[PDB]
Amino acid sequence: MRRYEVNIVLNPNLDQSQLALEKEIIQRALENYGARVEKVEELGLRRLAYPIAKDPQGYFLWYQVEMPEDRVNDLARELRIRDNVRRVMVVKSQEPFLANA
């Protein structure tokens, strides 16, 4: 398969039970689709550099994860789905590049 990093953001105004049920659907999905999680960060929340969700802050989640090429898009939408899905961004996973070396 191919791996990409998943970066998607869910609302700040989402209290507990919400963080819960929604991130939970999330995971469900990913899997359902065909993603084998590899690394889940969660820098939590931040003042986005520009109001978004009329929100000056939000909850950002990133999972280095892979899956079956083509189906990318499809799951992307599966996500965006849930309103709250403030943002849905996916990116092929190339490692790094040391400039100023």
Partner: protein, 73 residues
């Protein structure tokens, strides 16, 4: 010319690969928040190109305002 600041020698082993490099990218913002030119970045083609790509992924997921009010003036 444009040699009073210069940005290359402000960042060591620099991975032009983690869009989430907030505080580093936040380090090419100037004020109304443009994209400070080679004329400043001390960056190559390889540079503005890749660097930019992220710059872009960056505004995308946000966390860097793609321009934003200039104080004083």
């Amino acid at each position: 010319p444009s040699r009073k600041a210069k940005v290359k020698a402000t960042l060591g082993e620099f991975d032009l690969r983690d869009y989430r490099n907030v505080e580093v990218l936040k380090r090419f913002l100037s004020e109304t928040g443009k994209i400070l030119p080679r004329r400043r970045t001390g960056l190559s083609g390889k540079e503005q190109r890749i660097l930019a790509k992220t710059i872009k992924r960056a505004r995308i997921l946000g966390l860097l305002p793609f321009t934003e009010k200039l104080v004083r003036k």
